[PDB]
Short mmCIF file of N, CA and C and ligand atoms in Angstrom, two decimals:
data_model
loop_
_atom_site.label_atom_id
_atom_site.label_comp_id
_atom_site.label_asym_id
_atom_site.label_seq_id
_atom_site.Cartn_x
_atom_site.Cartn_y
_atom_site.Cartn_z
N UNK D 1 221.21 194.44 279.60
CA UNK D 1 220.55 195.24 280.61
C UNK D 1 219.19 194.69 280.99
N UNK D 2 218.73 195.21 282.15
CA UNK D 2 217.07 194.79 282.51
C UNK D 2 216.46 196.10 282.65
N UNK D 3 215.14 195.87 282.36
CA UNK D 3 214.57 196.71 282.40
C UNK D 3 212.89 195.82 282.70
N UNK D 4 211.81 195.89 283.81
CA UNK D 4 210.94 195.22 283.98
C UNK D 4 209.80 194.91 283.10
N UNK D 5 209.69 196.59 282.58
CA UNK D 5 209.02 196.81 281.86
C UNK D 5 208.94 196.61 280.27
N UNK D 6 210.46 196.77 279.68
CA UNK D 6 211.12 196.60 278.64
C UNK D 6 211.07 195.07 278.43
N UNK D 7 211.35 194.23 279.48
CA UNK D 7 211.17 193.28 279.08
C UNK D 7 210.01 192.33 278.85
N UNK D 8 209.59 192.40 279.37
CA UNK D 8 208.17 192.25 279.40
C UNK D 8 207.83 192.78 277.70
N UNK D 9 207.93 193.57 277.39
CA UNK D 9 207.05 193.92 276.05
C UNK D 9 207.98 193.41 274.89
N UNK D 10 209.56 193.10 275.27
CA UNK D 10 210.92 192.28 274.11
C UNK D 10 209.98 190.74 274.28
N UNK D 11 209.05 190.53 275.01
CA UNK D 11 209.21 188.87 275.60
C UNK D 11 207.80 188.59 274.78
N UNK D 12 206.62 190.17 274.52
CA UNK D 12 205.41 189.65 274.38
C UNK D 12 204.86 190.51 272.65
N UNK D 13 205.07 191.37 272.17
CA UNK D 13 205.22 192.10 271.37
C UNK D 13 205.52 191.37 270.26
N UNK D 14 204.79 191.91 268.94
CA UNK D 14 205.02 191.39 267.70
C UNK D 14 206.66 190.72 267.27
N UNK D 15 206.82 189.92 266.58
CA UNK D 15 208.15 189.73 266.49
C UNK D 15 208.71 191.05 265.59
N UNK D 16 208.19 191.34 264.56
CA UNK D 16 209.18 192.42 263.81
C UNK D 16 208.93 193.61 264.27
N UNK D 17 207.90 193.80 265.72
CA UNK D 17 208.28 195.27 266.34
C UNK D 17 209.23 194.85 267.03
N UNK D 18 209.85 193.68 267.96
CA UNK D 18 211.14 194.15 268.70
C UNK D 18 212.10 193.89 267.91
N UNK D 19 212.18 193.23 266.51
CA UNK D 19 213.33 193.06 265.98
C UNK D 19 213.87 194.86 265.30
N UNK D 20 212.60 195.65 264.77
CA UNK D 20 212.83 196.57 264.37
C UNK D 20 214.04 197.43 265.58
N UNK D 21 212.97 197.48 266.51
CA UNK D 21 213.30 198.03 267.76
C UNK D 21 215.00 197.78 268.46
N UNK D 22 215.15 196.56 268.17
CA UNK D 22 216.66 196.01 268.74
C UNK D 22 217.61 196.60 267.70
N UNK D 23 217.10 196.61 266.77
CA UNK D 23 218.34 197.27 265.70
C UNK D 23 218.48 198.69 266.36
N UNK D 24 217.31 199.63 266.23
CA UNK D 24 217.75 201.33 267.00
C UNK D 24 218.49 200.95 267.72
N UNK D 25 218.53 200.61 268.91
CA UNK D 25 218.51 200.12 269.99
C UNK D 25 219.96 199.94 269.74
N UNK D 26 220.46 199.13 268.69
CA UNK D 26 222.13 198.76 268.95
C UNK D 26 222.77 199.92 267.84
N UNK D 27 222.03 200.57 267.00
CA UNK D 27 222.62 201.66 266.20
C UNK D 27 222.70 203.08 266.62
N UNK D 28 222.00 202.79 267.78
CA UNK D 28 222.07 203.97 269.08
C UNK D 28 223.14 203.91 269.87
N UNK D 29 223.80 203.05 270.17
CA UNK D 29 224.65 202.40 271.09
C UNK D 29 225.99 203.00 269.80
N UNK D 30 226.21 202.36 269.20
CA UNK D 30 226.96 202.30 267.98
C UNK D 30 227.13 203.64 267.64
N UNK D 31 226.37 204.42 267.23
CA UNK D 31 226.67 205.95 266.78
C UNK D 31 226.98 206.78 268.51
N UNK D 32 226.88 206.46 269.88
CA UNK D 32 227.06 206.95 270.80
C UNK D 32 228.55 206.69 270.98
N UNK D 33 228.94 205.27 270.66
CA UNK D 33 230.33 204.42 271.12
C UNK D 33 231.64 204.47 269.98
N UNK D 34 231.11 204.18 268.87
CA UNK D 34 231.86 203.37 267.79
C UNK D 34 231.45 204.31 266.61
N UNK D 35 230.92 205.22 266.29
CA UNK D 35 230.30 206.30 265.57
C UNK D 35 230.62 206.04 263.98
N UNK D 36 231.89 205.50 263.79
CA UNK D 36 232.38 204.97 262.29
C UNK D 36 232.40 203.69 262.02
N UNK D 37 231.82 202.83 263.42
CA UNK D 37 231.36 201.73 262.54
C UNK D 37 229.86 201.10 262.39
N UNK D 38 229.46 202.35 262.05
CA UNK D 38 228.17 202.13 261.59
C UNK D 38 227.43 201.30 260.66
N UNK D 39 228.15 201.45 259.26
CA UNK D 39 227.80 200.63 258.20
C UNK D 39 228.55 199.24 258.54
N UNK D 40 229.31 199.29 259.35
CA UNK D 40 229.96 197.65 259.28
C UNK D 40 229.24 197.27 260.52
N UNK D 41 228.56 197.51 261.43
CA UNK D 41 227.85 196.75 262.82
C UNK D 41 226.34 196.83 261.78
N UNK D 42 225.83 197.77 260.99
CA UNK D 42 225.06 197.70 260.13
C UNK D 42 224.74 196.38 259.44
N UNK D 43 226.09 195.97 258.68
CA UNK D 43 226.35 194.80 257.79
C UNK D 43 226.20 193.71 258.48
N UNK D 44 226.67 193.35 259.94
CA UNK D 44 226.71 192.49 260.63
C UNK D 44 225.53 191.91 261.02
N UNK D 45 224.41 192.92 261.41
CA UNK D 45 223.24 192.84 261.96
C UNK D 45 222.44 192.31 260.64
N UNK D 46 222.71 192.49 259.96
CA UNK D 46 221.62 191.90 258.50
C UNK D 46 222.23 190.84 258.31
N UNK D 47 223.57 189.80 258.15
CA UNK D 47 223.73 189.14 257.89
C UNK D 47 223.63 187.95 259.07
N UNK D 48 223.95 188.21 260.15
CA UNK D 48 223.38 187.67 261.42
C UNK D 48 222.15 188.05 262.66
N UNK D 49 221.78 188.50 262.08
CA UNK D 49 220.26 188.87 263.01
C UNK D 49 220.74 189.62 264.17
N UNK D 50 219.24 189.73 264.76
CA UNK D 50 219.50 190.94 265.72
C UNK D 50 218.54 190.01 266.78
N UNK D 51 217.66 188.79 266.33
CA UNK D 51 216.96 188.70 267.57
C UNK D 51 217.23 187.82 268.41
N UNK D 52 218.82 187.38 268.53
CA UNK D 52 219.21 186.37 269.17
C UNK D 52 219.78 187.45 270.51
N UNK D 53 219.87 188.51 270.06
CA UNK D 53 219.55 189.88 271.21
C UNK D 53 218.61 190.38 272.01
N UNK D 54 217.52 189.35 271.88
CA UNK D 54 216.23 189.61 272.71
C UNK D 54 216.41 189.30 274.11
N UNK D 55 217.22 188.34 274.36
CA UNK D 55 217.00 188.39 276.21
C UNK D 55 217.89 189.32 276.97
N UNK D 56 219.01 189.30 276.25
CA UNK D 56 220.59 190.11 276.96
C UNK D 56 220.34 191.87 276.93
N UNK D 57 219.51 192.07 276.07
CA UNK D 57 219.16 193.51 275.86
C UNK D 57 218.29 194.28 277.05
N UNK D 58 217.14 193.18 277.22
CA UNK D 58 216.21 193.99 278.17
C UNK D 58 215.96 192.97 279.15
N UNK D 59 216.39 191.56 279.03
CA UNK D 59 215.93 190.86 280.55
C UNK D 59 217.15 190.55 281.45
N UNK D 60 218.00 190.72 281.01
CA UNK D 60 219.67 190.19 281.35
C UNK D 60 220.25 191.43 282.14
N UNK D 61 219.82 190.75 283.90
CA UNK D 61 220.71 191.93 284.74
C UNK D 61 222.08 191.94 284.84
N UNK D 62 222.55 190.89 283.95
CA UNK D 62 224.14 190.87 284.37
C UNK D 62 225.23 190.87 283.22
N UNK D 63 223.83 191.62 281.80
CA UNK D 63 224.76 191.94 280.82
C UNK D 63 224.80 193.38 280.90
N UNK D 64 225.63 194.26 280.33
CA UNK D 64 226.05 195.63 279.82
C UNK D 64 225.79 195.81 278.64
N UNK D 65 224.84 196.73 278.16
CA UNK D 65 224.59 196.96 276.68
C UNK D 65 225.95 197.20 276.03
N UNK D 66 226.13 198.22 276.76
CA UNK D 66 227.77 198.80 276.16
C UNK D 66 228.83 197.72 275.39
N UNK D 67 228.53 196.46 275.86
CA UNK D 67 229.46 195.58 274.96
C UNK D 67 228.54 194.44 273.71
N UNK D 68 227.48 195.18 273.77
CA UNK D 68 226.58 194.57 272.44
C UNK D 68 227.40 195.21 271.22
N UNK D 69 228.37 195.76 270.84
CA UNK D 69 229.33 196.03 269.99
C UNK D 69 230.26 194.98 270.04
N UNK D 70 230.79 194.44 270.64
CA UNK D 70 231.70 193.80 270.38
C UNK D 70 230.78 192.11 270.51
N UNK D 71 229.61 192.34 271.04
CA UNK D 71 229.15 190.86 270.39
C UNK D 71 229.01 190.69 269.59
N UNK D 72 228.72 191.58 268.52
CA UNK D 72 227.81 191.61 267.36
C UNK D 72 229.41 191.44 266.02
N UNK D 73 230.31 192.17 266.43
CA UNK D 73 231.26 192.13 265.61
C UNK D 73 232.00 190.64 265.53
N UNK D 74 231.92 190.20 267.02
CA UNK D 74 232.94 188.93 267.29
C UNK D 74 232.41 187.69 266.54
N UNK D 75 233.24 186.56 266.55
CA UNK D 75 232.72 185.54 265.87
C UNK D 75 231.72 184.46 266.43
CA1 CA B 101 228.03 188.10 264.78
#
């Protein structure tokens, strides 16, 4: 998703405030979408990071958050 403002502060902001931030951010998504796979998109995100999610989240007009679940799960 984009957001002008959002991005702007994913692009300039401490690194472990947007990394904190991107995790809500996809465990929000996750308990809205996928609600039981919490602890396993959980597991995923710690063992592969979350900040390779910094541009597609808030600067990327031509991604859909809605399928940051199935990025995060896929290989
Ligand atoms: Ca992954």
């Amino acid at each position: 998703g984009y957001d002008k403002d959002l991005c702007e502060w994913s692009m300039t902001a401490d690194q472990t405030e947007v990394e904190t931030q991107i995790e809500a951010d996809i465990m929000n998504i996750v308990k809205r979408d996928r609600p039981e796979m919490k602890a396993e998109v959980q597991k995923q995100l710690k063992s592969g990071g979350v900040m390779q999610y910094n541009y597609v989240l808030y600067c990327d007009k031509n991604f859909n958050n809605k399928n940051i679940i199935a990025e995060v799960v896929g290989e």
